Paper text:
Despite sequence similarity, no mechanically evoked current was detected for heterologously expressed TMEM120B, a homolog of TMEM120A2. We carried out a comparative structural investigation between TMEM120A and TMEM120B, attempting to uncover their potential difference in mechanosensing property. Most of the residues in the dimer interface are highly conserved between TMEM120A and TMEM120B. The CCD is the less conserved region, but the overall structures of CCD between the two proteins are the same. From the structural perspective, there is hardly any hint for the difference between TMEM120A and TMEM120B in sensing mechanical force. We also examined TMEM120B using the same system, and the current mediated by TMEM120B was slightly smaller than that by TMEM120A at the same voltage level. By contrast, no significant difference was detected between cells transfected with TEME120A/B and the empty vector-transfected cells. In this study, the almost identical structures between TMEM120A and TMEM120B, and our electrophysiological characterizations do not support the role of TMEM120A as an MSC.
Numbering used by the authors:
A (entry chain B), B (entry chain A): 5 to 237, 270 to 329
Write the structure that this text describes.
Amino acid sequence: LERCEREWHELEGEFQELQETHRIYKQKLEELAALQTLCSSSISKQKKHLKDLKLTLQRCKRHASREEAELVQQMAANIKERQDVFFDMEAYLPKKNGLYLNLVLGNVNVTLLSNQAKFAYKDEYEKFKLYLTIILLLGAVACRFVLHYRVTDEVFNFLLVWYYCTLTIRESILISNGSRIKGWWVSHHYVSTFLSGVMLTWPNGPIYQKFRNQFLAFSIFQSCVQFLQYYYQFLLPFLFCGHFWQLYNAVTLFELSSHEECREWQVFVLAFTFLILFLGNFLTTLKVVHAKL
Amino acid sequence: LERCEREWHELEGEFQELQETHRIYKQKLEELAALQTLCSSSISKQKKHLKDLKLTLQRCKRHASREEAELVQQMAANIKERQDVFFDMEAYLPKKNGLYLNLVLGNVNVTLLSNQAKFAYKDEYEKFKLYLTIILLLGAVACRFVLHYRVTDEVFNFLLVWYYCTLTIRESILISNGSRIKGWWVSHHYVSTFLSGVMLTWPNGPIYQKFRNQFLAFSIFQSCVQFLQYYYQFLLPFLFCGHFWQLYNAVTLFELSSHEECREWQVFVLAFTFLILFLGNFLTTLKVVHAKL
């Protein structure tokens, strides 16, 4: 066991070496905290001077001599340069979280702060989306054709609502990390996870047994659009057809609310979710077309 | 507008100063990456030498002379010291996540790595738990006494299942950050969020209208126990009474499955969740009593 003793001697040497490295590490951590305080002060002073200078550009915008007109145009080009460069250093800098991520994960720092790390996280997000849309597809056209029971549709709706919550957490991380994808999309995911829930708690009458087929076909259309929307990371006509299929569902269910003598409250709170999810995404696509135009 | 020009001159000076600080910051980031690679190598070599040395202690454990017996006892005291000290530097060190947090948040680093930051995060977690158990309490005894409708019970069950998922994400962060609270508790939260779901999808017959009252009283007992379990951060007798109330629910619903001529599948998948949640938490408490003893 003397071998263990001499090995211990070697590990004590390595232990004091790692103690040295760990206390150097703690010194570096204190230096990092100091520079984070300094950069936060820099954020404050930079944004203060930004609002002051755009106020100066605002009240200087009124008409005067040609020389100050050249000065205003020149300062406009520079102020565009100002926002681009401060967007760069505000991208790398670690940043306070939003509100929803604050409400779920609490006060914790999730900023990668690295270009290649952001790229890798985007690839991971794309891979996760493809995998779970494969599982959902093998369940939409599957549930429609083999198993016609209530319990499997409940399980499928649990999987859809869980999937939508995971996507909204992921996209909150993605927005607080890097590029701004803020717009219709995050509110689209919120209203779509609300839509998942209403279908689940129907009282399983004949009316659910009629609306089930159109809902499952609509899901198949949604899975195919998201799948082809990833292989690209063409798409527009199938997106228009998705909007029109959504309109088909909305009109059919809205007419269905009048047809039966007695209505649940859940056939009429559910149609208007489809209609809001029509006017939102379709018009956003035409805005992207105008962005293309 | 010449004031803006001279201010610009000052901001260009501050801009090159912040460019200097930012490139120093990037140099420090590269140094951090290098020391993280070094400390990961240290992790590998330390754990390798740990398994080798505990193997040496294992096959050296066999009976021999008194001198090596003193050596084995002495090395046992030191190896306990070895695990304590390596637990310390493996606590501060940033660490790879588990599996569930990997499945939800993806590959992202959530290690605070700071004692006071961990303490602050624990206080935030305690505050969040108290606030949402207040909201749930004002809903359990509330739903029971004023509003007897299906939709409000669905909303309350949505709030409970959302609350349980948020707690399991928070405790995953807490375990991957600091102390080991791994045991019955995280699996308890998983089976309890499974329990929330089964109650929600009942077909609203008379039988649900009978089981509702005992479920809501049980929730009130649960909210009071969690509230008193926080004010401490006494508890044992009310915890025993919670277990026995859980047994009351289990026996009543198990007898209820036989009483009615026709049974849904959801009165018999739901009772055994209560029974598993009885044998688990009660026996864990007596283990804590034995830990006290």
